[PDB]
């Protein structure tokens, strides 16, 4: 028998703690499946850190007062990097280092209240220089296309460096909310996916999140 909280249609009016759980769950789920199936990235750690994903998230979340949108964005930044950086693959060997970077960049590029890298580095558990390059790298592989908007990923894909091919391949007007429907889209998605207490990080919060029909 387990509790059954009902979340708000607006992730802003939702508990920052409840997000980190929903996000973390989703995060180890992708790690499970991605490993269910070589060349290293800056986001690779020499071995799986002992601290769980969730225990690492709240900490970053609490001692750096990361805002809601920044939380969602971080997750979305996964689908963005996995798509425009072939080598990068979310697995329990990149997650943390990614999360640090992801989170500290969504904040700086998108928020009014933001800290310094050295602060972020300290809370995150790494050397400032380590976080600098770790941030510079991610920014290059995305061409500073960090604003979660409907066609961002595509534009990013395209904008990438393109291999010339023998045979050729292949506006937000009228677009609802002017194309800012990404973060909600994901919010809804995670509750539908890892909403129930059936992912793996069961150990963390024993809760069943039901998002109003």
């Amino acid at each position: 028998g387990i509790p059954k909280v009902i979340l708000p249609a607006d992730f802003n009016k939702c508990s920052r703690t409840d997000l980190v759980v929903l996000i973390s769950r989703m995060l180890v789920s992708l790690i499970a499946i991605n490993e269910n199936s070589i060349t290293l990235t800056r986001y690779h750690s020499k071995i799986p850190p002992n601290i769980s994903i969730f225990n690492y998230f709240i900490r970053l979340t609490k001692f750096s007062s990361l805002e809601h949108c920044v939380l969602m964005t971080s997750l979305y930044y996964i689908d963005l990097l996995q798509t425009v950086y072939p080598d990068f693959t979310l697995n329990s060997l990149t997650a943390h280092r990614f999360l640090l970077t992801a989170t500290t960049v969504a904040t700086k590029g998108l928020c009014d209240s933001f800290s310094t890298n050295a602060h972020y580095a300290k809370v995150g558990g790494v050397r400032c220089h380590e976080l600098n390059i770790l941030e510079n790298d991610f920014l290059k592989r995305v061409n500073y296309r960090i604003i979660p908007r409907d066609h961002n990923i595509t534009l990013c894909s395209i904008e990438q460096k393109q291999k010339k091919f023998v045979i050729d391949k292949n506006s937000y007007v009228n677009r609802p909310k002017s194309g800012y429907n990404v973060l909600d889209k994901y919010y809804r998605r995670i509750v539908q996916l890892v909403g129930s207490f059936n992912a793996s990080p069961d150990k963390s919060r024993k809760v069943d999140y039901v998002l109003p029909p």
């Binding site: 590029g109 928020c111 009014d112 310094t116 600098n132 941030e135 510079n136 500073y144 604003i147």
Partner: protein, 284 residues
């Protein structure tokens, strides 16, 4: 941030090279991240284009389309030695037209400039006006908690924003346009404040004090003054006219009033502005 003049090698087309060094306790300047970031989102004819970015070692350079001078520089040239002097009205309607056009664009993409002023309005030899420096801008399409920031001048800052507001929208930019305008007409700053205290006074001097009945929400403003020396609105014509050598027609005035309201919600929108009778001739 240090900038230099440069020019394409493949193409002779000149450019502007703003240089932002890398590696620091803050690594990549949030300002750069924010600027570069939004610029890729703002492709319009009245919004300086960001050609490309050149990362390298500990130095990042953003390559902007080189623009000659600016609304500020432009006017000084005109009457730097002859004290304040406004511009030819046809010219005042033209530049104002471009500024609302580019801004109108920003707002549609849910982006607020937040720091509009004469110098942040680049012009090229072709007389084209374009919005600049998006360093303090932000995408309001992303519902984060807002926090105004420190600017070097408060001559274009909205009253409510100066009164501690943190829930403003696109309305903040419209006020600036109102100021920008008045300055282009008369040739000098309409609110030469010297601090948040001073500015608010000068704004209230000509606009009168807030009307808690036409602007109820003002009581919610953190730096609001429940018991302040009320004042009536001084009338615009008799404030500007005497310093402009052309009969400020009716429309210009009505338009000017629509951009210079105290109550944000009463301020005209860039879209609405572009459809004000004062610009009729640009249509049909």
């Amino acid at each position: 941030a240090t900038v230099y003049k440069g020019l394409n090698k493949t193409t002779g087309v000149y450019v502007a090279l703003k240089e932002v060094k890398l590696d620091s306790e803050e690594g990549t300047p949030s300002t750069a991240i924010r600027e570069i970031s939004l610029m890729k989102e703002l492709k319009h004819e009245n919004i300086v284009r960001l050609y490309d970015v050149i990362h390298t070692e500990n130095k990042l350079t953003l390559v902007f389309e080189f623009m000659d001078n600016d609304l500020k520089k432009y006017m000084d040239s005109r009457t730097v030695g002859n004290t304040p002097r406004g511009l030819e009205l046809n010219l005042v309607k033209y530049f104002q037209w471009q500024l609302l056009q580019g801004l109108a664009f920003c707002h549609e993409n849910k982006i607020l400039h937040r720091d509009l002023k004469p110098q942040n309005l680049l012009i090229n030899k072709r007389g084209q006006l374009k919005l600049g420096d998006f360093g303090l801008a932000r995408a309001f399409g992303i519902p984060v908690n807002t926090f105004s920031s420190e600017v070097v001048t408060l001559w274009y800052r909205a009253p409510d924003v100066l009164m501690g507001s943190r829930t403003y929208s696109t309305s903040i930019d419209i006020w600036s346009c109102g100021c920008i305008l008045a300055e282009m007409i008369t040739g000098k700053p309409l609110f030469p404040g010297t601090n948040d205290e001073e500015q608010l006074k000068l704004i209230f001097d000509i606009m009168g004090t807030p009307n808690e009945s036409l602007w109820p929400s003002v009581t919610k403003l953190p730096k609001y003054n429940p018991n302040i020396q009320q004042r009536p609105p001084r009338d615009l014509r008799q404030v500007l006219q005497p310093h402009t050598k052309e009969p400020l027609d009716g429309n210009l005035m009505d338009f000017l009033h629509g951009l210079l309201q105290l109550n944000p919600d009463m301020r005209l929108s860039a879209k609405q502005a572009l459809h004000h009778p004062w610009f009729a001739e640009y249509y049909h």
